[PDB]
Amino acid sequence: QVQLVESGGGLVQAGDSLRLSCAASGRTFSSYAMGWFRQALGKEREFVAVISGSGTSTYYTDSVKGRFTISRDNAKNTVYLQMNSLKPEDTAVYYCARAKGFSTIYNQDEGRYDYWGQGTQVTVSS
Amino acid sequence: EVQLQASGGGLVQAGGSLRLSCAASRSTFSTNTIGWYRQAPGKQRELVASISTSGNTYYPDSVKGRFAISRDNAENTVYLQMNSLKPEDTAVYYCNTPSRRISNFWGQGTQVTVSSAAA
Amino acid sequence: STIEEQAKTFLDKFNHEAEDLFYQSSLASWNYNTNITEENVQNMNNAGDKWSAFLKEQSTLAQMYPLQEIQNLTVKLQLQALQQNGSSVLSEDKSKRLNTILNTMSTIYSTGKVCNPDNPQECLLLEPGLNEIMANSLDYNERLWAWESWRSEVGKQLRPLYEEYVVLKNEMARANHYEDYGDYWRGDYEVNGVDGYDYSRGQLIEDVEHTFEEIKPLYEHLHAYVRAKLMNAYPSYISPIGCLPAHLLGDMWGRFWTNLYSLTVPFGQKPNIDVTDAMVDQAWDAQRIFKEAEKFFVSVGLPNMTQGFWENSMLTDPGNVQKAVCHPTAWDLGKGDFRILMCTKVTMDDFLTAHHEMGHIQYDMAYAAQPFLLRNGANEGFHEAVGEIMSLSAATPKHLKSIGLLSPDFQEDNETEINFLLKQALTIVGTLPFTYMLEKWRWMVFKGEIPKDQWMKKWWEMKREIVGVVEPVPHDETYCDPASLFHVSNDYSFIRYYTRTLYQFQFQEALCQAAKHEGPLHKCDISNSTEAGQKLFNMLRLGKSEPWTLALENVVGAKNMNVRPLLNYFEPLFTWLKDQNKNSFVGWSTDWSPYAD
Ligand SMILES: *[C@@H]1O[C@H](CO)[C@@H](O)[C@H](O)[C@H]1NC(C)=O
Ligand SMILES: *[C@@H]1O[C@H](CO)[C@@H](O)[C@H](O)[C@H]1NC(C)=O
Ligand SMILES: *[C@@H]1O[C@H](CO)[C@@H](O)[C@H](O)[C@H]1NC(C)=O
Ligand SMILES: *[C@@H]1O[C@H](CO)[C@@H](O)[C@H](O)[C@H]1NC(C)=O
Ligand SMILES: [Cl-]
Ligand SMILES: [Cl-]
């Protein structure tokens, strides 16, 4: 049974870094893209980043480009999200999800992700 | 920066010796095969000696055992040592690369005249 | 004095001058293919143009030596190859135009990208982007998008160029007294004036087609088994009687079904015979892959790689800043300089490619003694068959276990035997109808049998009839799906891959006989056999000095390509697939299509 468990959510200050980890079960981890989404209080769930099944290709949303870095360890079935220079606008519940496909260019919207984590709240203060 | 100009030719007695020099640029010397050609006034051009970058040499039967093509890496020069000359070797000598031969780019030639021997 | 003695003199001058011109042309090509820059592309073109001019000069010079008045076979063969006019038979404007089309098609293929419609900066290239989707993706829609976007953005671009290419290529071939460009390509197999060893260009079609009929039952059973496995992998998308949707075959075209192994593995719970994970677990690098391949050749009596091979080869992707062409290539620059260019990944497919390409290098090192013009394989299939000989042995579980990629507690079961042969058939058998149908299309197009207004109509009728593969979306005449594959848009004959496939099992059968191998041909590893190495080397050092019919006979005892050894190799799998498909449909209906409703 495919299960995703996020770890690393916490309260940080502005400018500080925070790494979210995501462990996923299944022997075909390398065959699917892994993506991160976030949902602020009162706002809809939005896309953050995606990494191809091989790890050699990544894509980030305009708000986090050059601050966040998505990585994956296919040997340990994990996908990481380093969030450097955090802003109050980044405060949201973060979800890691598994895509239907392998690429970054085709899997960057909710309708492309069939497996989801339970969420991890990340809070940023002034 | 004009290369492949033959020099050293002059008047020589029968059975004599003469050495022609071919000044080439370092870029051409290091990457091109260099050949020596000759042309009798009225007759066609004839390759008399050729030397690859590895030092491999080619000579026709007409000059085998008499002529010697050499490469001097210190002075980027190809020399043609002609021993036991005959009036049949009287021609103007040119040095060229196979690619310049195809594209018809010919440099300066050196006239070698061999005078007839005594009784 | 005699015309033969005159020709000998001419060939001595040729062999002398060719050394530097060829080496400078090859070095420039190497320096461009490893560091793609505008300065290097112009250097490559300058040196290449000098080589072409030398070849056109020596060609016209070779004409005054009638090869009928020549008894010495070595000089006759060199003269025969030099007096071929080829592209020089065309007018200056037509030679310029044809080279323009060839370069344009080549750069459209190598620089063609599919983009996001709402974000044109977000794009994918064929390699690695679109090829990674086709090799690893499990989503029908993503695979369909990658497949259709390749054929739609890039294939549609090549269509007008290909139409012009066939015209000029046919003019070139007909001016050289060939029927058409297809007939010209089939000339590689032609042998003449050698009693008992003759081979005609028309004989190639008859032999390829007669051989293919014997392949057909093994393929249909492999196809039916894969189709059943694919119905589990992509539910609602495959018909039990129809063709296989073109976008679900493992690569961008279905040239090889290798990447269907995860989806079609007969016995999934058995220790994987795809050592790709064991390489990764053991931290193997490209140097280990290449040093291991080098150790294989040394074991059969052949030499180690030269110092210049380890100094000058590019065995990994330079990637960042320095860009390279990652097509695995074996380079014989001349002057004793041998190199391999390959952006090696830690995969079993690349481990087998390292052996294949070093086999090419070993052939090059062996025939280096031959005169310049005779430094090639006996025919286009010879070099490709030799590399595949190395792969056949490298891939066996007996071999992988001995090199550490398979546990010392690995037990060869009758199940691991089927797991192995199925993996082999996806690559070797799976490519035979693809290859035959690809060339059959070109041959008919060059012949004039397929009008332009039916090019794509016929391509997909032939894909459905011969390959049992069906387009997932309808393609009109604005597409040029053949040109969306490297060899089609880059002007390379494809039948070499069909002939090499048959030669490889003839050679393997002969080499295992030399190695005193007991048992099935698929359980043979020629490692540590110098008897097998000598038998191979004696053919390798020969180059093109003997006609291919004779060259093949000297090793296998048959002066012609034979399908029997290939079928004996896959016999255990054939009888297995027969039982698996007992309640299945074997064959396909060319009327079912993913888009029919
Ligand atoms: C390409 O090759 C090397 C790569 O390091 C580089 O030094 C050289 O300048 C390059 N050639 C060019 C830019 O023409
Ligand atoms: C053919 O000529 C070549 C070059 O001189 C020579 O190596 C070879 O022995 C000849 N073959 C014969 C005499 O059959
Ligand atoms: C040009 O080469 C062809 C072979 O490709 C040959 O048949 C023909 O005689 C040659 N043309 C000449 C010598 O003008
Ligand atoms: C030959 O067998 C294997 C390769 O298959 C190798 O491990 C072994 O060292 C070789 N035998 C000898 C005597 O070197
Ligand atoms: Cl002909
Ligand atoms: Cl296609």
| SS3 state of residue B3 | coil
In the structure encoding, which two tokens stand for residue C284, read together?
Answer: 């193997």
Question: What separation, in Å, do the N-terminal and C-terminal C-alpha atoms of chain A show?
Answer: 41
Report the residue from A53, A75, A107 with minimal CB separation from C136.
Answer: A53
Residue of C nearest to B57 (CA): C16
User: B102 and C53: CB-CB below 8 Å?
Assistant: yes
Ligand 1 centroid to Cα of residue C3, in Å, is 49
CB atoms within 10 A of CB C172: 21
Residue stretches of the annotated binding site of C for substrate: 255, 327-328, 497
Q: Is C402 in the pocket of ligand 4 (CB under 6 A)?
A: yes
CB atoms within 10 A of CB C17: 25
Contacts of B56 in chain C (CB under 8 A): 16, 19
Q: Which one of B28, B32, B33 makes the best mutation probe of the C interface by having the most chain C beta carbons within 10 Å?
A: B33
Alpha-carbon distance C28 to C333, whole Å?
A: 10
Looking at this protein, which amino acid is placed at residue C279?
M
Q: Which residues contact C42 (CB under 8 A, 6 or more apart)?
A: none
Closest CA to C312 of C285, C332, C284, C282: C332
Alpha-carbon distance C411 to C73, whole Å?
A: 52
Q: Is C370 in the pocket of ligand 2 (CB under 6 A)?
A: no
Q: Which residues contact C160 (CB under 8 A, 6 or more apart)?
A: none
Provide φ and ψ at B41, rounded to 5°: -60, 105
- How many whole angstroms from its chain centre is CA C424? 16
Looking at this protein, which amino acid is placed at residue B100?
R
Contacts of C138 in chain A (CB under 8 A): 28, 31-32, 100-102
Half-sphere exposure of B115 (CA within 13 A, CB side): 5
Question: Per the structure, how many domains does chain B have?
Answer: 1
To 5 degrees, how large is the angle CA C168–CA C173–CA C175?
Answer: 95
Contacts of A57-62 with C-beta under 8 Å, sequence gap 24+, read: A57/A103, A57/A104, A57/C129, A57/C132, A58/A104, A59/A104, A59/A105, A59/A108, A59/C122
Q: Over the Cα atoms of chain B, what is R_g? A: 14
Report the residue from A28, A30, A106 with minimal CB separation from C142.
Answer: A106
| SS3 state of residue A27 | coil
Question: Among C84, C85, C184, C192, which residue has the most ligand 3 atoms within 8 Å of its CB, making it the best to mutate?
Answer: C85
Contact between B112 and B13 (Cβ < 8 Å): no
Contact between B96 and B107 (Cβ < 8 Å): yes
CB atoms within 10 A of CB C465: 15
Contacts of B52 in chain C (CB under 8 A): 16-17, 19-20
Could you tell me the strand order of the sheet in which A68-73 lies?
A4-7, A18-24, A78-83, A68-73
Contact between A93 and A84 (Cβ < 8 Å): no
Neighboring chains of C (3 or more beta-carbon pairs < 8 A): A, B
List residues in chain C that are followed by a break over 2.5 Å (C to N): none
Measuring from atom 10 of ligand 4, which residue has the nearest CA? C528
Question: What separation, in Å, do the N-terminal and C-terminal C-alpha atoms of chain C show?
Answer: 79
Contacts of C146 in chain A (CB under 8 A): 103, 106
Q: Write b or e for each residue in B65-104: b if 16 or more Cβ atoms lie within 10 A of its Cβ, otherwise e.
A: ebbbbebeeeebbbbbebeebeeebbbbbbbbbbbbbeee
Closest CA to C437 of C474, C481, C477: C481
Contact between A64 and A55 (Cβ < 8 Å): no
Q: Which one of B47, B58, B61, B99 makes the best mutation probe of the C interface by having the most chain C beta carbons within 10 Å?
A: B99
Closest CA to C99 of C160, C168, C5: C168
Resolution (A): 2.7
In the structure encoding, which two tokens stand for residue C204, read together?
Answer: 């190639």
Q: Write out the H or E segment, with its range, that includes residue B23.
A: strand B18-23
Could you tell me if C137 lies within 8 Å of chain A, comparing CB atoms? yes
CB atoms within 10 A of CB A50: 28
Alpha-carbon distance A102 to A74, whole Å?
A: 13
Contact between B36 and B107 (Cβ < 8 Å): no
Provide φ and ψ at C215, rounded to 5°: -75, -40
The sign one gets for the Cα dihedral C207, C210, C213, C215 is negative
Looking at this protein, which amino acid is placed at residue C384?
E
Experimental method used, please? X-ray
Half-sphere exposure of C309 (CA within 13 A, CB side): 22
Q: Which one of A32, A51, A102, A114 makes the best mutation probe of the C interface by having the most chain C beta carbons within 10 Å?
A: A102
User: C53 and B53: CB-CB below 8 Å?
Assistant: no
Alpha-carbon distance B9 to B2, whole Å?
A: 20
Query: What CATH number belongs to A4-125?
Result: 2.60.40.10
Half-sphere exposure of C318 (CA within 13 A, CB side): 12
Contact between B34 and B107 (Cβ < 8 Å): no
Half-sphere exposure of C478 (CA within 13 A, CB side): 5
Contacts of C142 in chain A (CB under 8 A): 100-103, 106-107
Alpha-carbon distance B4 to B24, whole Å?
A: 5
Q: Give C129's DSSP letter.
A: I
Contact between A67 and A85 (Cβ < 8 Å): yes
Contact between A79 and A115 (Cβ < 8 Å): no
Q: Is C39 in the pocket of ligand 1 (CB under 6 A)?
A: yes
CB atoms within 10 A of CB C47: 23
Task: Calculate the alpha carbon distances from C301 to C353, C367, C372 in Å.
Answer: 21, 16, 25
User: B50 and C13: CB-CB below 8 Å?
Assistant: yes
Residue stretches of the annotated binding site of C: 151, 255, 327-328, 356, 360, 384, 459, 463, 497
Contact between A33 and A104 (Cβ < 8 Å): yes
Ligand 5 centroid to Cα of residue C175, in Å, is 10
Domain that residue B50 falls in: 5-115
Measuring from atom 4 of ligand 3, which residue has the nearest CA? C84
| SS3 state of residue C63 | coil
In the structure encoding, which two tokens stand for residue A10, read together?
Answer: 């916490």
Strands B57-58, B45-51: pairing is antiparallel
To 5 degrees, how large is the angle CA C268–CA C272–CA C275?
Answer: 150
In the structure encoding, which two tokens stand for residue C77, read together?
Answer: 């063969």
Contact between A8 and A18 (Cβ < 8 Å): yes
Looking at the annotation, which residues of C are catalytic?
Answer: 357, 487
| SS3 state of residue C562 | coil
Could you tell me if C142 lies within 8 Å of chain A, comparing CB atoms? yes
Could you tell me if C68 lies within 8 Å of chain A, comparing CB atoms? no
Q: Over the Cα atoms of chain C, what is R_g? A: 24
In the structure encoding, which two tokens stand for residue C20, read together?
Answer: 């530097």
Beta-strand (E) ranges in A14-101?
18-24, 34-39, 46-51, 58-60, 68-73, 78-83, 92-99
CB atoms within 10 A of CB C491: 15
Give how far A36 is from chain C: nearest CA, Å.
19
Rounded to whole angstroms, the maximal C-alpha distance in chain B is 49
Contact between C22 and C332 (Cβ < 8 Å): no
Question: Would you call C200 exposed, middle or buried from its count of C-beta atoms within 10 A (0-12, 13-18, 19+)?
Answer: middle
Contact between C74 and C160 (Cβ < 8 Å): no
Q: Which residues contact C57 (CB under 8 A, 6 or more apart)?
A: B102
User: A105 and C132: CB-CB below 8 Å?
Assistant: no
Closest CA to A117 of A43, A16, A10, A21: A21
CATH number for the domain that contains residue B33: 2.60.40.10
Looking at this protein, which amino acid is placed at residue C17?
E
Residue of A nearest to C130 (CA): A103
Could you write out the DSSP letters of every residue in C465-515? III-EE-SS---TT--GGGGSHHHHTT--STHHHHHHHHHHHHHHHHHHHT
Could you write out the DSSP letters of every residue in C177-229? T-SSHHHHHGGGG-B-S-TTT-B-HHHHHHHHHHHHHHHHHHHHHHHHHHHHH
Closest CA to C284 of C396, C405, C409, C135: C405
Chains B and A touch (3+ CB pairs under 8 A): no
Give how far C139 is from chain A: nearest CA, Å.
5
Contacts of A32 in chain C (CB under 8 A): 138
Cis upstream peptide for C128 (omega within 30°): yes
Q: Over the Cα atoms of chain A, what is R_g? A: 13
Closest CA to C594 of C455, C487, C475: C475
Could you tell me if C57 lies within 8 Å of chain A, comparing CB atoms? no
